[PDB]
Amino acid sequence: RGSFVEMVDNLRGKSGQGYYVEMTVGSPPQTLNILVDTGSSNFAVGAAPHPFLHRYYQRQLSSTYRDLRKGVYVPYTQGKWEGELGTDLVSIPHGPNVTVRANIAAITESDKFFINGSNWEGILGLAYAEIARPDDSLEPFFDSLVKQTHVPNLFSLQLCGASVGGSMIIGGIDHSLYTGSLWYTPIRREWYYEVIIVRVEINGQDLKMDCKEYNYDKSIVDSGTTNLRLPKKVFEAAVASIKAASSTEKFPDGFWLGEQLVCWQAGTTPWNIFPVISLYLMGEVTNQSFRITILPQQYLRPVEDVATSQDDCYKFAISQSSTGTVMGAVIMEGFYVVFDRARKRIGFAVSACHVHDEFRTAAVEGPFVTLDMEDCGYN
Ligand SMILES: C[C@]1(c2cc(NC(=O)c3ccc(C#N)cn3)ccc2F)N=C(N)OC[C@@H]1F
Ligand code: NA
Ligand code: NA
């Protein structure tokens, strides 16, 4: 408990491409890099020679592979994959020292799924069976891990943004990964890691929206999404106060819609004209909340692949949603995030590694008094 040196620094990534962990599947073990995703629930790996893939799972080489004789077809909003279900022995080399028999979807066809130039070739869905494909009887990896071993039913994520890195602590919390105190918000329902946002401030100014709007139709914590996505009506209001707060420069409207980059002369980004964003989350106690605050260092993402520009270019990375609030890598990179499944709660603490400056830092502060927090949840 509290100290897991072998697991610190076990994540890697490139900006724009997510955070992956090394895993092994089958006997003898095949090493694969696997995207860590708290917004889905299937363990799914490339299992054929798609040109974008460095490595893929070769079931024929594994003596402990068992076929389930069932296909799975998984379309997303963007992209899809299709695959064949089975089980096999799975370990995490920089993880707990155990091996478990997990479901694996061997991906045999995909579209707009793998990223060309990325270093990962599957996904580890860490959310709950309720959203597993094809249905909730396909037990997710972390459920198998907890059933089969003595690993405590929790994991924690420290995502360090821009090469990126971080730590996934499986079965525990490592106190060297955060400063000050953890504050917990209840998991409203076990499917996604769904939470409830009770108030939103831009530079300390309240948006003053009916709080149910913040959670329409849910709010989730998702390591497999880069952006902070906000429900359309909330995004319109939040961009409007952000534009106002940042008045002392003017940008094309396109910038705010993520339709254009903005660039500055290297080493001169004026962070200070951009406001901080705070989300108050439902706390553990009736009428009690806490707040997390992120910086423009989190929501202005650097874009390297600008082979038609010389300078320091950024994407505005808060965007409108039709799926509810998504607290993606934009939120998570400020924090050490504890997925405390055993107590159905998610903890946040200021990350010991988040990107900040001399004037402002990401922050997790409480308690605050907030009434009618149960009305904020959408039904
Ligand atoms: C399974 C799914 C998914 C995620 C990804 N995720 C990614 O490419 C990706 C990229 C950058 C960052 C960051 N920072 C996180 N993830 C790719 C394909 C997918 F297919 N997971 C989530 N959470 O959202 C969309 C999709 F459902
Ligand atoms: Na157990
Ligand atoms: Na600490």
Side-chain angles (χ1 to χ4, degrees), residues 38-302:
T38 60
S40 68
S41 300
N42 285 81
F43 184 34
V45 310
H50 189 283
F52 295 176
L53 297 183
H54 290 79
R55 290 154 287 279
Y56 52 93
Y57 181 29
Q58 287 189 105
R59 292 166 286 167
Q60 74 274 11
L61 299 186
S62 174
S63 63
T64 44
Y65 177 68
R66 308 171 183 172
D67 199 338
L68 281 168
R69 301 176 179 86
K70 199 164 140 64
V72 60
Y73 182 93
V74 179
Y76 301 109
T77 300
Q78 30 218 219
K80 47 117 162 137
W81 54 267
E82 167 161 52
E84 292 166 10
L85 302 169
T87 71
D88 206 341
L89 300 190
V90 180
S91 311
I92 303 177
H94 304 290
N97 216 227
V98 302
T99 291
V100 313
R101 172 164 295 274
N103 292 310
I104 306 172
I107 295 168
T108 54
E109 192 276 348
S110 65
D111 211 85
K112 292 192 178 186
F113 177 72
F114 291 121
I115 299 171
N116 188 24
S118 80
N119 199 38
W120 54 264
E121 46 266 350
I123 302 196
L124 186 55
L126 289 163
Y128 295 96
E130 177 68 15
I131 60 172
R133 322 268 189 111
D135 53 66
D136 65 5
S137 76
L138 194 79
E139 174 173 271
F141 171 74
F142 204 89
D143 299 66
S144 301
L145 174 66
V146 171
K147 279 211 195 191
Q148 293 169 41
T149 70
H150 300 265
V151 180
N153 190 16
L154 93 167
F155 65 87
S156 59
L157 288 179
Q158 191 204 42
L159 304 189
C160 308
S163 260
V164 295
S167 285
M168 180 173 62
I169 308 305
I170 289 135
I173 288 163
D174 187 308
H175 311 293
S176 78
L177 300 182
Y178 67 97
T179 59
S181 180
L182 287 157
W183 282 86
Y184 291 94
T185 192
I187 289 171
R188 195 197 184 193
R189 163 146 85 103
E190 290 155 302
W191 59 323
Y192 299 89
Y193 285 108
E194 178 183 0
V195 299
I196 285 163
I197 295 164
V198 308
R199 172 177 164 109
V200 176
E201 280 175 0
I202 306 294
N203 251 15
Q205 291 257 232
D206 194 333
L207 282 187
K208 283 165 210 192
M209 290 187 77
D210 168 13
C211 66
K212 197 183 306 286
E213 302 286 358
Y214 305 140
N215 306 292
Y216 174 52
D217 56 294
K218 51 188 191 296
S219 291
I220 69 176
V221 183
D222 185 5
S223 64
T225 293
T226 297
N227 280 11
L228 168 59
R229 303 233 298 268
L230 295 173
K232 174 169 187 86
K233 211 170 273 165
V234 168
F235 170 84
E236 282 165 2
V239 159
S241 22
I242 302 162
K243 289 183 171 166
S246 64
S247 280
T248 50
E249 289 176 45
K250 190 98 270 141
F251 312 113
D253 296 291
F255 165 72
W256 303 108
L257 294 163
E259 293 175 342
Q260 287 163 254
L261 300 191
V262 62
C263 309
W264 293 274
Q265 177 195 300
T268 60
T269 304
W271 300 112
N272 315 343
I273 68 156
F274 293 94
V276 292
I277 299 159
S278 302
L279 308 183
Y280 289 66
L281 305 172
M282 182 181 279
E284 293 192 279
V285 176
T286 297
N287 286 339
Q288 170 264 314
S289 67
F290 64 100
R291 81 171 173 230
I292 65 177
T293 299
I294 55 165
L295 306 176
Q297 282 90 345
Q298 274 76 72
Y299 63 78
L300 293 214
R301 323 285 292 175

Side-chain angles (χ1 to χ4, degrees), residues 322-343:
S322 43
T323 63
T325 290
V326 182
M327 294 168 61
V330 163
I331 295 288
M332 300 183 70
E333 293 174 358
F335 307 103
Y336 184 44
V337 186
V338 179
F339 298 74
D340 184 350
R341 292 161 57 105
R343 272 91 115 204

